[PDB]
């Protein structure tokens, strides 16, 4: 029921694709797991606030405008889902 490993669900080729979108052509092997940790850090940084909004709404299911709020708190305002 519980989950233990999904950080490896972000595969090395997916990271390679993102770096090609980032304009990176050559990637060290040390990159991938450290970037997994960094993005994971960003993930609880956003999802803690998202959960806080969700419980403060007296909802158990996470809704998208809560995510919109939590992303504009980090100076990372997202367009196309507000409202």
């Amino acid at each position: 029921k519980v989950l233990r490993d999904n950080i490896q669900g972000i595969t090395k080729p997916a990271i390679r694709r993102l770096a090609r979108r980032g304009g990176v052509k050559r990637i060290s092997g040390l990159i991938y797991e450290e970037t997994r940790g960094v993005l994971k850090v960003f993930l609880e940084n956003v999802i803690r606030d998202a959960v806080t909004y969700t419980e403060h709404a007296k909802r158990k299911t996470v809704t998208a405008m809560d995510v919109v709020y939590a992303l504009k708190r980090q100076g990372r305002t997202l367009y196309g889902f507000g409202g």
Binding site: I10, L18, E44
Partner: protein
Amino acid sequence: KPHRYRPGTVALREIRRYQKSTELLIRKLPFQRLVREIAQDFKTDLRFQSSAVMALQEASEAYLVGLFEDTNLAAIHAKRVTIMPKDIQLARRIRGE
């Protein structure tokens, strides 16, 4: 003879492709698994609107991509072409993360 491109040529070709493309580079279902895993670590039995998971996605690689142009500028700043994790540490520290 089986053709083989020299290194960087292909990588530049999908650089151009993914700069052209707008589609999402992450396997969606493993990403959703990771979201539910991390969110369960703070509150159990969390249920997600799929649009919320999607928005969390493009926010995530928005941050990741912008990090990669930052680190790519750092690497070419250091006269190198192969990226190092210390470049990522530098970018995070300069951004104040």
